[PDB]
Each structure stands twice: as C-alpha cells, then as structure tokens.
C-alpha cells in the first residue's frame, strides 16, 4: 500500500 502511495506522489 504505502509503496503505491509514494508511486502516486512521484507520478504526480
């Protein structure tokens, strides 16, 4: 989960 959150931050 949190890895996907960071992924989402860095994609933005």
């Amino acid at each position, epitope marked *: *989960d*949190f*890895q996907d*959150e*960071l992924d989402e*931050f*860095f994609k933005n």
Partner: antibody
Amino acid sequence: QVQLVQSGAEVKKPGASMKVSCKASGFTFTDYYMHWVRQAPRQGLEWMGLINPSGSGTAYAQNFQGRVTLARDTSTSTLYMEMGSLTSDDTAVYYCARMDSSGSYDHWGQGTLVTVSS
Amino acid sequence: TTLTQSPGTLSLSPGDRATLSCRASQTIRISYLAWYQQKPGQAPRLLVYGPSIRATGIPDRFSARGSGTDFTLTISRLEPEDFAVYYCQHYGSSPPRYTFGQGTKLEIKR
C-alpha cells in the same frame, strides 16, 4: 539473505562533502524504495530522504533539502547518498534502509560512521 | 508531525509486560506508524507496523496499537534480548516524509 552493505567509515573536514554507498544483494533492488537515516552519537534516528526504485524521484527531510543528494545505480544495485557543507553536527552513523511496501524499513545496512571534525 | 516517546527510560524485569508510548503532535493513522528495536552498536530492526502487523520473524510477544495521537508498543513478556532502545516512526506519502520518536530505552530493573 537480504544484504545492504554500506561503504566504509569516512572522516571529513568541515565544509567538505561526503558520498556514502550501500550495495544491495539478495533481493530485486529495483523493486524497493531506499531510504537514508542517520544517527548521531547517543542520539535518535533521523530520516534524511528516500529515492524511488527507478532513481527518478527523491524526497528529502526538510532539514537536509539542499545539502543532500540521493542516487541509485541499477547496474551495480548500489544506493548512494551525497551530503555537502558538512559540519561536526553531521557526525553520525548513516544507514541505508530498504522500505517494505507497508512503508516501514524491513532491512537496514550495517551503517557508515561519518566523522566530521577539524 | 513530530513523535514523542515516553517514558525516556523504561525499567522492567525480564518476563514483565512492557508498554512503550509514542505521542504524535497531531492525529495520525496507525497504519503509518512503525516500531523499531535497536541494540547498541547495531542497526535498528523493524518490529511491528500498522495495526499490530509484526515484521517477518518478529515473535508474537510484540504488538502495537493506538489511535489519534496515542500509540503504544507492547512486549507482553520481556526476554533478555528485548532490553534495547525502541523507536517509533511515522511516515506520510504527500509529500513523502518520515519522522522518528526520540527513542525509549528499555532497561533492566534491579
């Protein structure tokens, strides 16, 4: 059999820059966010920054923004941290840490003593 | 968000039940709180994170709980190797930020 093998201890003069490294083995390096944490003598843990698995994205602690650079080398499975304008307050053990998907650090390097002193 | 741990030093006997407290400056979710153990001269070791999810190979005597600003790590029966320093850690993703409590020393009562 996760291995995070950090570069050796460093001594630095104030105002110098340092580059510390952490070589990963035993796991798929490019699947993991990697983090740097430091611990000054008899003090607590302090986050410095993270770098995403591709190496394209980093995020630094506000107290280190500007003076810290994170890089990773997919070819050597090696995490790097560079930190500039060192003062004696940066004397600390520097740890690389592998982030589990939960966001916690499931595996740590053995640490790198960086001594900053005139 | 800063984390403040209490007490600074907890003195217990092996076999006791230890509760270590982590206090966040503002409300956080337990899922973004992790607990680490560090023995002197060693790197920290993740114990428990989130709603009492124990790290791989962490025995069942380690648990964590809490809500709002109040979180706890419990060691239900202290082993000699459990006397160490314990750090809580909080993380957020937007923007990516990590922070640690200042550490609680778990000392042998005598």
